[PDB]
């Protein structure tokens with residue numbers, strides 16, 4: 361009957377004593393948690409001076425009882441069922457190509473405040489490594505790869521040069537209503553360049569430009585299909601571009617923005633489709649991938665904590681991986697192995713295989729001169745709907 365304790369907001373207190381290759385430290389956390397909404401705010405402060413490890417490495421160690429378990433998963437919250445007596449949480453965090461954390465936490469209720477006292481032991485770490493070297497950036501949630509935008513710039517520039525190769529070698533001149541599709545693809549390519557300059561801010565500017573240039577591409581190619589599929593009016597005379605005054609792209613680079621020739625004329629048609637029909641699908645593919653990237657951003661930064669039952673020890677086990685963003689683009693794998701056991705003798709809910717969707721944002725207090733870390737977490741349970 362511990363779920364009734366987490367209705368509303370309850371205070372949190374976190375203390376951590378750690379020792380990593382002899383370097384000792386202490387962290388004191390304070391804040392509040394809301395299990396009904398799946399959030400919790402905390403402000404951790406290092407009390408021994410300067411922290412010898414990056415703050416993101418301690419986030420997983422520094423209270424899964426504040427998870428937003430839906431009503432169809434209420435009988436799977438092992439954390440709340442152990443309260444107020446509490447539970448013990450031991451982990452083994454294996455950092456790839458580096459050391460290994462081994463923690464022992466005691467999460468329980470002390471009257472009205474949820475207390476989590478942890479002992480940490482770091483071993484086999486390297487001073488030149490990404491842990492003891494503080495080479496991990498603060499906001500660790502996504503790799504922010506640069507070669508991904510450059511690869512989209514390749515497939516965008518390849519189509520551009522292929523279009524010019526069709527026109528200047530195969531002697532198939534472009535149409536007017538067509539040519540605008542070159543600008544739309546050029547806007548997609550340009551978005552790939554700004555996005556690849558400094559992706560680790562400003563990427564959103566490149567993404568909306570990519571979103572816009574692809575949507576303009578599906579608009580122009582749609583009109584390009586209807587003119588080429590339906591009976592040509594035959595009386596609507598030919599066309600030329602009408603670029604803006606400040607941007608005479610036909611006057612600046614005439615061999616790319618030409619429009620000598622007009623639409624409503626089937627130039628290429630292969631594999632049962634026309635030239636505007638293939639570009640319509642390409643721009644739709646560009647727009648779909650652009651939409652997928654936007655919808656990915658919320659769930660791109662969250663890690664899943666997969667949980668199984670351990671009825672032999674009347675507890676649970678949990679495995680999950682965490683990739684920390686190293687400075688200069690590298691990745692640091694943190695392999696986690698969790699093991700929870702109740703403290704009290706009251707019965708606990710042994711859950712089926714489910715996972716906890718956890719997303720964390722790290723910030724700073726502009727008026728705190730100590731080594732600190734402001735924390736906010738989003739914990740929601742998901743998995744089998746039964």
Ligand SMILES: COC1=C(OC)C(=O)C(CC=C(C)C)=C(C)C1=O
Nearest residue numbers: 519523526534535538539541542545
């Ligand atoms: C020479 O005719 C033309 C092409 O070659 C088939 C194009 O690829 C394109 C644009 C291609 C893409 C992928 C937007 C245009 C606008 C064009 O007029």
